[PDB]
Symmetry: none
Subunit: 102 residues, 2 copies
């Protein structure tokens, strides 16, 4: 399943204990394009070896501060505790690539 985290220490602890995490900083509103959240959930169900985490930017101020989130959605790939890659935008291709190469 998709994880739902809003507390920094819980995210930080996840990053310690799992190997590959893809974070989706999302909002309960859309901008220029439809939500990619169904595709994120679909990818979560295909790559059980990766932890897929959704972080509601309107509920996780501390994480958004720490991670320097400026726009939504922002997707961050983290391996072995360290950030590998991030992009912003509701872009199915970019998300697939990130997951593919995780």
């Amino acid at each position: 399943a998709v994880l739902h985290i809003n507390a920094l220490d819980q995210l930080t602890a996840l990053l310690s204990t799992e190997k590959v995490i893809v974070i989706d900083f999302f909002a309960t509103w859309c901008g220029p394009s439809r939500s990619i959240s169904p595709y994120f959930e679909e990818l979560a169900g295909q790559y059980n070896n990766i932890k897929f985490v959704k972080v509601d930017v309107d509920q996780a101020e501390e994480i958004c501060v720490n991670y320097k989130v400026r726009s939504m959605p922002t997707f961050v790939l983290v391996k072995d505790g360290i950030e590998q890659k991030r992009f912003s935008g509701a872009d199915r291709n970019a998300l697939k690539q990130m997951v593919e190469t995780a």
Copy 2:
């Protein structure tokens, strides 16, 4: 119960005529907009002394510009012709406060 308005001069005339208005900027292609749309419409029945309006962002560019709406759903409270409050996102509780605290 819920007025649908995509022209700027039409909205502005409404807002120059009615005392209290809550506007819902929506996109049918936006999941969270769909989710709360039902509740907005429910609330529109419930509170009869507030004019409830939907503006489709795909049909309402000039309105989206004057209002600086770039996200949906965005709800805006206008009272006595002045914008009082706004918020974006499908948060049913925020919408209730707004509707309740119209200061009526």
